[PDB]
Design a protein around this nucleic acid. Structure first.
Ligand SMILES: [Mg+2]
Ligand SMILES: [Mg+2]
Ligand SMILES: [Mg+2]
Ligand SMILES: [Mg+2]
Ligand SMILES: [Mg+2]
Ligand SMILES: [Mg+2]
Ligand SMILES: [Mg+2]
Ligand SMILES: [Mg+2]
Ligand SMILES: [Mg+2]
Ligand SMILES: [Mg+2]
Ligand SMILES: [Mg+2]
Ligand SMILES: [Mg+2]
Ligand SMILES: [Mg+2]
Ligand SMILES: [Mg+2]
Ligand SMILES: [Mg+2]
Ligand SMILES: [Mg+2]
Ligand SMILES: [Mg+2]
Ligand SMILES: [Mg+2]
Ligand SMILES: [Mg+2]
Ligand SMILES: [Mg+2]
Ligand SMILES: [Mg+2]
Ligand SMILES: [Mg+2]
Ligand SMILES: [Mg+2]
Ligand SMILES: [Mg+2]
Ligand SMILES: [Mg+2]
Ligand SMILES: [Mg+2]
Ligand SMILES: [Mg+2]
Ligand SMILES: [Mg+2]
Ligand SMILES: [Mg+2]
Ligand SMILES: [Mg+2]
Ligand SMILES: [Mg+2]
Ligand SMILES: [Mg+2]
Ligand SMILES: [Mg+2]
Ligand SMILES: [Mg+2]
Ligand SMILES: [Mg+2]
Ligand SMILES: [Mg+2]
Ligand SMILES: [Mg+2]
Ligand SMILES: [Mg+2]
Ligand SMILES: [Mg+2]
Ligand SMILES: [Mg+2]
Ligand SMILES: [Mg+2]
Ligand SMILES: [Mg+2]
Ligand SMILES: [Mg+2]
Ligand SMILES: [Mg+2]
Ligand SMILES: [Mg+2]
Ligand SMILES: [Mg+2]
Ligand SMILES: [Mg+2]
Ligand SMILES: [Mg+2]
Ligand SMILES: [Mg+2]
Ligand SMILES: [Mg+2]
Ligand SMILES: [Mg+2]
Ligand SMILES: [Mg+2]
Ligand SMILES: [Mg+2]
Ligand SMILES: [Mg+2]
Ligand SMILES: [Mg+2]
Ligand SMILES: [Mg+2]
Ligand SMILES: [Mg+2]
Ligand SMILES: [Mg+2]
Ligand SMILES: [Mg+2]
Ligand SMILES: [Mg+2]
Ligand SMILES: [Mg+2]
Ligand SMILES: [Zn+2]
Lengths: 140, 97, 108, 280, 166
RNA sequence: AACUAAUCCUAGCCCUAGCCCUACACAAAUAUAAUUAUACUAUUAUAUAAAUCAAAACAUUUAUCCUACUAAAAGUAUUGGAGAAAGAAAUUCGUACAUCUAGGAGCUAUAGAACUAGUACCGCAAGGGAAAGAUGAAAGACUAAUUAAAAGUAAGAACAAGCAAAGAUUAAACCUUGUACCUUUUGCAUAAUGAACUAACUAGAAAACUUCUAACUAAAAGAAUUACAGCUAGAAACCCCGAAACCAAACGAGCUACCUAAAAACAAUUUUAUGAAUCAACUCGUCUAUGUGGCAAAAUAGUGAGAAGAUUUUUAGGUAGAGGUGAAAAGCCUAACGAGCUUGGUGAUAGCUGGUUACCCAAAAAAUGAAUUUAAGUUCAAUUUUAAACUUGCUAAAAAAACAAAAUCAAAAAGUAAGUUUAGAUUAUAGCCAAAAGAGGGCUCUUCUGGAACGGAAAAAACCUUUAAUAGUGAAUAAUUAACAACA
RNA sequence: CACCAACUUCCUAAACUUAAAUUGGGUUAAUCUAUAACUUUAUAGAUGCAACACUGUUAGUAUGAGUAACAAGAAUUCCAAUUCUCCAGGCAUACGCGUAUAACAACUCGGAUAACCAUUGUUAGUUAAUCAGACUAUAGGCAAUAAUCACACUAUAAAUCACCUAUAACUUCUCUGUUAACCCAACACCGGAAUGCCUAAAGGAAAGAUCCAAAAAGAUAAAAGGAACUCGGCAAACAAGAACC
RNA sequence: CUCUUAUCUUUAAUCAGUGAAAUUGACCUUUCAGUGAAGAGGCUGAAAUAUAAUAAUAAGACGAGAAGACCCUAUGGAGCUUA
């Protein structure tokens, strides 16, 4: 036995420290703990991407609740704000509804009015003056 | 795994004992001595591998030539069996032909 | 049929620590007035019973000596007397057993 | 038995870790531990805060009376206390803090502006602030960890030393930065304790010659269940002044009183943020 | 093998100051090698947990298991040393804080079967541990009342926060 | 707050150097059934080693085994189913450490000898053959301590829901997402092998040619060798476990088969005058149930056959594996005989099964053609690949041919970065599904194209959307099982 | 008349582009040696240089599971004691075994549990001229006629040293076996084991305590019917008989 | 057998003592329809659902141990017979 590995104690502890919060023999038996830890790491990596998608669904759900209190569907509210050159994202809109109820109501009226202007422009045909809020500022 | 619960006793090495101090002296006996002696003649070891090197099969066959006739019965039986095993490995087995 | 899997320590703890398998506590333990040793209400005291049986052996040992052999059962009643006591008239013609020691206080 | 001492050396370190967790060591003051020079540490204290101090004054502040007693007892087997600086430093802070509060909240009652000053000069705030500025490390005393009354005293002595060296204007900035900051996010009544809020409200309304409020039930939900919500609004002259939520009518009504008071004294949540912009 | 239970009796605290509650006494005792299974001894050790010395000795005297007699003798020696060596005033003023069983060193033998086969037999042994603490037994458990249950439920509802938002 | 455990250093060993040996151990006993004081009754190795194995079979043949100084001549002359392989001499060279009674980039209790011991134990015998120990200067100081430390348990059973975790969260569980691991299969598994858990042990080895780094250079090398820039030195490489067999020499007939010698048993009843009859003792084992790790590695409970004979039984001796014995069942020869057992040849051989231990970066297959006692394997082409030299490649491609009435061919241009030659090297040589065109009539072949999601079609290897892979509580989009009963 | 939806693409910071035998390259865990360093490090030279997997080898500990299975006749005045209830191969010799023999003391290991020892330790034991074994004077000469109650009687398989002639010696008891609940079968195994006497005068104990479920095994009884059962009268029966191929 | 029944002994069950074996990737171990390799406790869609023991049945876990048999291959063997 000329040369023998003298570090096996610390190589074992690297795996087992990640398994202390498991239940069963998975938290103390190396041949079992090693299989469980790698499955956990794979799940951890795939859940970094899925987290971002989940939060967007939460934002859209809460926005629909806030708009419907004022009689608006989600597609109408979001689309018309864009046509008014408002570039607030969904994450910040949720903050206003929860924490700034009066400001959110003001935005609700603005989106509704722009929708009405579009309806009038559609039904009326020919050359007619454009809506007050339907004027687009230009950049160069 | 289980590890020592105490430190082993210290090892103290004298780097200036006679063997260490004079290592290498007379390695140039030939060039500085008019070539009366070759440096290989300064080597101490088994009779059959002084100033010579080879693979395991070559070492086994060389040992038999030098001291084969002065060996014990059982030692010689094992040496002969080792030769035949090495012969079949080196001449019939391996990745490369 | 053989087990298809090992049973875990968690499942095993639930089988053998169930309240059905534990030792029940006893409510019928009391103290004996005469000796002060413990007993169950529906059972005789062991310490007090032990006294009586020891005396019974002594009497029977004496009865064996008098008879001297098997098949010697008398056809008349028996009675026991202790040192300092003499048969009464009613005791006439009844087997008498003699004990060296004095009459025990509990024995009447 | 394997050859080598390196694995044995490593394991001794882990045995050290295990022993510490099971038997935590008693606390020790940093002065005892290595890498300590008193003179250098004091100078860095001033420069850290971007303030200039006189070395002789600043050192006196840290010395405490209890420390002197211990040294003499050991001596048998000069110095100079910080008592003078403590009294001066505390006095200015009380006046300076009052001046800040009155300008910000003139309407708020006098008793109120005493509770807040008492709140911001108590052991809880002062001890918490003192430790994070290293005051505890530099203190000289006979007991460690330093008791809170001792720790509090040395803190104000330092402000006193700052006052002498650099004058009032500098110290006012010092109190604003480190003491006034501690009231961020704190609701009024969390720092001032008032029982029977309605009684106080009635007196305050009388002073401005306003009629006593009329309690009414603005909104209601789930009254008969075990989780009811109530909104009670105080109406004055048929005009709404405050509205409050609660579990029960009595609790909700009391809540409306606190809402009203806060508006009167101008300590509302949406009040103008404090101003640290001034460099002067 | 480890023998730490024995040494626990030799701890010495510094004298208590006048303004302090009186510290109760503690006694540790065990019997080491016993020809009995530890699984079986567990049921006996479990029963007397929390009881006073007199109540424990009463229940043991009327149990039919072989382990009951061995536990009783260990209990009697613990009581004797408590008064004699650990400055306990009254014998009756004691209760069982801890009682448990442990595995001992065992022996391996052969068990015969019917076709020239065999099996491995174990002759099993166990330990017994106890700790005696001076004072009346601590009061028993009281189940939560209906009012206590509800108060927890409101506390849970009050703890809620708005999740994943500013 | 601790049980079971764990920590340790020296007992010895291994390979060389040196040297022949003169060790042949009170009294008594022992070759007789050894260890029994005296006569019977004589005492004595062996003709040439074989086979496995290599020749991809096998039949001549197959290094060492089966020893005669180192270095060279030389793997040369010669021998050989002239093939696997085998292999000299003439002739040159050499006094060697030389008290080195000494040494170690050898092992430290699963290592090193099997060894504390050829003991305990197993076998009739030849023969096979283990395990383990740990205080201190002093025990004439009560046997020492040290360690959250393995699996296993205890302290302390459990609480709707699910490969047991991950994103999370004020909050352990509730909500959302998610078809265990290795090997093998067609790149596919809810297929099928393997794993109760812990600790230790347990599997790639050589220098002909090539590339890299130096010395000297028409010469290099410390004698024998190579040379039209060479030559010398260094570094760089090719696994483990597992048969049924075959041969040589011992050991076995206390079981069983048959034989030799000396001995023994057989009541009662009817017949007679006996391989007769009824039926015990005794010998055998028809049929059924129980038993099946059994009381038993072939039994128990009943029920059955013979029982003065070719009967049964005891003691001692004989025949031995190319053999013996056999009222022939290819039965029996010490529980496993179509040919005993043990040791050695022996690390037998295995184109077949299983396994083959740290990280990162980069590139990459097809699984077509040809020969083969070849199709469970191998060699050559073709592919891929690393390095080097230097110059045209890929897509496209007019007319004008050759064909018959889209494959060749490749001017000039344009979009674009590969291609040829030289040197070295393996692995691989069975695919699978979808969509076209045929040919033998749902399979079976041949030919062209595409594929191997983490999104979608309900789950979903092969259909559709998709240029690599990173952090973020940003944003715009892609594919996307559904579609809106009469007259006229 | 739109929205939602893949690291596809853009944005802040970065990056510089598509399963697998095989192939080309940069690092590194551990230990030893040279020279250094001094709470465990540096440059070089080395090697028995790294295991979640071979129905791998050795040791340890779980699961199945406190489960399957194992055992001592009754009362008393007490286990070499008395009496009672029931069962029915015992005593010697040969072969083999080798202290298991007896007393005391122990209560660890052994008996598959206790009591008690068959276990551990210490001390003791089996006595022969008759029972059993071993037991050296020499050389010659010579044999027709079984046994079975041996008479009758036949038969067929044809059948257990003595006595004489000569030579030599001319009083003797040492040596060895002797115990037992015992041997061959891995075991305190429902198995195997020769001969003589005898058949209870010798030798023994089927039930640890309690309860009276299912299923399973063994025994006995059964109305009316009597092979209708089943591959088959297998098994059982108040039957145990007859005939034919 | 129609057509089964009753009793006793052994087993069984409860208490006391001693105490094995094959087996075992991990398990927090449900039903129905669909998908699929005649195949799902674990996948898709629905539904059901406080926690643990003791005694029973044998549908499933392609249930466990099978030295259990049929088909094919190898320039693997052995016994027997010959022309
Ligand atoms: Mg998205
Ligand atoms: Mg459960
Ligand atoms: Mg076991
Ligand atoms: Mg061959
Ligand atoms: Mg020559
Ligand atoms: Mg060894
Ligand atoms: Mg060994
Ligand atoms: Mg542990
Ligand atoms: Mg869940
Ligand atoms: Mg198979
Ligand atoms: Mg398996
Ligand atoms: Mg390991
Ligand atoms: Mg014989
Ligand atoms: Mg015989
Ligand atoms: Mg007769
Ligand atoms: Mg026979
Ligand atoms: Mg007959
Ligand atoms: Mg007959
Ligand atoms: Mg006859
Ligand atoms: Mg025949
Ligand atoms: Mg035949
Ligand atoms: Mg045999
Ligand atoms: Mg091999
Ligand atoms: Mg092809
Ligand atoms: Mg051919
Ligand atoms: Mg092949
Ligand atoms: Mg061109
Ligand atoms: Mg991309
Ligand atoms: Mg790959
Ligand atoms: Mg290794
Ligand atoms: Mg293994
Ligand atoms: Mg167990
Ligand atoms: Mg069970
Ligand atoms: Mg049962
Ligand atoms: Mg049972
Ligand atoms: Mg009995
Ligand atoms: Mg005896
Ligand atoms: Mg005795
Ligand atoms: Mg004895
Ligand atoms: Mg005689
Ligand atoms: Mg004789
Ligand atoms: Mg005798
Ligand atoms: Mg047997
Ligand atoms: Mg048995
Ligand atoms: Mg008798
Ligand atoms: Mg019974
Ligand atoms: Mg009957
Ligand atoms: Mg009838
Ligand atoms: Mg019929
Ligand atoms: Mg029928
Ligand atoms: Mg019959
Ligand atoms: Mg029991
Ligand atoms: Mg469940
Ligand atoms: Mg189904
Ligand atoms: Mg499902
Ligand atoms: Mg079933
Ligand atoms: Mg069953
Ligand atoms: Mg199966
Ligand atoms: Mg072939
Ligand atoms: Mg062949
Ligand atoms: Mg052959
Ligand atoms: Zn009494």
């Amino acid at each position: 036995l000329r040369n023998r590995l003298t570090d096996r104690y610390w190589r074992v502890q690297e795996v087992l420290k990640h398994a202390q919060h498991f239940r069963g023999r998975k938290n103390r038996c190396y041949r079992l703990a090693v299989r469980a830890v790698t499955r956990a790491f794979v799940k951890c990596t795939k859940a970094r991407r899925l987290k971002k998608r989940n939060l967007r669904t939460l934002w859209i759900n809460r926005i629909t609740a806030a708009s419907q209190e004022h009689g608006l569907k989600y597609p109408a509210f979001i689309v018309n704000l864009i046509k008014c050159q408002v570039e607030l994202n969904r994450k910040v809109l949720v903050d206003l509804a929860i924490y700034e109820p009066k400001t959110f109501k003001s935005l609700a009226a603005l989106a509704k009015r722009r929708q009405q202007e579009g309806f009038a422009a559609a039904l009326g045909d020919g050359k007619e003056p454009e809506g007050i809020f339907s004027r687009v500022v230009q950049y160069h | 795994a289980f590890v020592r619960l105490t430190l082993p006793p210290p090892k103290v090495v004298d780097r200036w004992n006679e063997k260490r101090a004079l290592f290498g002296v007379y390695d140039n006996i030939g060039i500085l001595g008019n070539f009366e002696k070759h440096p290989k003649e300064l080597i101490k070891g088994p009779v059959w591998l002084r100033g010579w090197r080879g693979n395991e099969l070559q070492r086994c066959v060389r040992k038999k030539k030098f001291v084969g006739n002065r060996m014990f019965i059982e030692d010689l039986h094992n040496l002969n069996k080792r030769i035949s095993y090495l012969y079949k490995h080196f001449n019939r087995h391996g990745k490369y032909r | 049929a053989a087990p298809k899997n090992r049973r875990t320590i968690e499942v095993n703890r639930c089988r053998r620590r169930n309240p059905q398998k534990l030792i029940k506590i006893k409510n019928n333990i009391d103290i004996c007035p005469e000796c002060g040793h413990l007993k169950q209400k529906h059972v005789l005291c062991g310490y007090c019973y032990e006294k009586v049986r020891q005396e019974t052996t002594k009497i029977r040992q004496q009865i064996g000596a008098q008879e001297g052999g098997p098949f010697r059962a008398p056809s008349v009643e028996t009675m026991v007397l202790y040192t300092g006591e003499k048969p009464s008239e009613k005791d006439q013609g009844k087997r008498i057993v003699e004990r060296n020691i004095k009459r025990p206080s509990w024995f009447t | 038995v394997k050859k080598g001492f390196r694995a044995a050396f490593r394991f001794q370190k882990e045995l050290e870790r295990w022993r510490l967790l099971r038997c935590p060591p008693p606390p020790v003051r940093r002065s005892e531990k290595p890498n300590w020079d008193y003179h250098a540490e004091v100078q860095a204290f001033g420069s850290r805060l971007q303030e200039t101090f006189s070395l002789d004054l600043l050192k006196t502040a840290f010395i405490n009376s209890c420390y002197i007693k211990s040294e003499e007892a050991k001596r048998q087997s000069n110095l100079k206390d910080n008592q003078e600086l403590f009294e001066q430093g505390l006095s200015f802070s009380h006046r300076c803090l009052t001046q800040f509060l009155e300008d910000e909240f003139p309407d708020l009652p006098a008793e109120g502006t005493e509770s807040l000053v008492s709140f911001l000069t108590g052991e809880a705030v002062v001890c918490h602030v003192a430790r994070n500025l290293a005051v505890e490390q530099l203190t000289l005393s006979a007991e460690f960890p330093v008791p809170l009354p001792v720790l509090r005293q040395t803190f104000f002595a330092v402000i006193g030393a700052l006052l002498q060296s650099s004058g009032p204007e500098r110290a006012a900035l010092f109190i604003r930065d480190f003491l006034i900051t501690q009231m961020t996010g704190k609701e009024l009544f969390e720092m001032w304790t008032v029982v029977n809020p309605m009684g106080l409200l009635v007196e305050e309304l009388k002073k401005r010659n306003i009629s006593a409020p009329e309690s009414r039930l603005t909104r209601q939900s789930g009254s008969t269940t075990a989780l009811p919500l109530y909104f009670v609004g105080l109406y004055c002259d048929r005009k709404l002044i405050a509205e409050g939520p609660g579990e029960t009518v009595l609790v909700a009504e009391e809540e409306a009183a606190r809402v009203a008071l806060r508006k009167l004294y101008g300590f509302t949540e949406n009040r103008r943020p404090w101003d640290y912009s001034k460099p002067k | 093998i480890s023998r730490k239970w024995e040494k626990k009796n030799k701890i010495v605290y510094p004298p208590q100051l006048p303004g302090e509650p009186r510290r109760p006494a503690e006694i540790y005792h065990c019997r080491r090698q016993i020809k009995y299974s530890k699984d079986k001894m567990w049921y006996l050790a479990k029963m007397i947990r929390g009881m006073s010395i007199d109540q424990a000795l009463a229940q043991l005297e009327f149990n039919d298991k072989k382990g009951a007699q061995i536990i009783k003798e260990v209990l009697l020696e613990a009581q004797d040393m408590a008064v004699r060596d650990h400055n306990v005033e009254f014998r009756s003023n004691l209760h069982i804080a801890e009682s448990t069983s442990g595995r001992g060193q065992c022996l391996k033998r052969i068990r015969y079967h019917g076709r020239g086969r065999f099996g491995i037999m174990e002759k099993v042994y166990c330990h017994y541990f106890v700790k005696l603490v001076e004072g009346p037994p601590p009061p028993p458990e009281v189940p939560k009342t209906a009012v206590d249950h509800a108060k927890d439920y409101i506390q849970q509802l009050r703890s809620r926060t708005i999740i994943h938002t500013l």
